Design a protein around this ligand. Structure first.
Ligand SMILES: Nc1ccn([C@H]2C[C@H](O)[C@@H](COP(=O)(O)O)O2)c(=O)n1
Length: 126
């Protein structure tokens, strides 16, 4: 299986979420940002790489957040806690970014796969 890694960046008590711009089925919906692990990379390497490219930040990759999500037979999606080392996030690849609190997480129009993590994210912010 192909692994897709995603980051739950919590800073100053809020969670960063990212609004996809593609493909049409997901454009406008919100996600934890990340991307595919390439063969030869660790999960930490891949996630830090993706968030540097997508957001313009250097992060440290920490513990898993929640369980794996099966995207299909082909791919699996995994979230990690990440924390900021340097930089301020900007939507280089996404439509928008938002910092959200616990109360806002269940109301967000999540991409269907990431929605599974709602209870985990609420707990992390509580
Ligand atoms: N937090 C994320 C990141 C990605 N994906 C999905 C969208 C694609 O089906 C696949 C690979 O993502 P991308 O198209 O961004 O490379 O993973 C997802 O559901 N949730």
């Amino acid at each position: 299986k192909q692994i897709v890694v995603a980051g739950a960046l919590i800073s100053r008590g809020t969670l960063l979420v990212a609004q996809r711009d593609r493909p049409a089925e997901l454009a406008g919906l919100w996600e934890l940002p990340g991307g595919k692990v390439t063969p030869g990379e660790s999960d930490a390497d891949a996630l830090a790489r993706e968030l540097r490219e997508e957001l313009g930040v250097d992060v440290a990759v920490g513990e898993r957040l929640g369980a794996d999500v099966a995207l299909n037979d082909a791919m699996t999606l995994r979230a990690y806690r990440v924390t900021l080392r340097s930089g301020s996030p900007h939507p280089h690849d996404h439509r928008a970014l938002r910092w959200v609190g616990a109360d806002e997480i269940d109301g967000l129009a999540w991409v269907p796969a990431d929605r599974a993590w709602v209870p985990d994210l609420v707990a992390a912010l509580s």
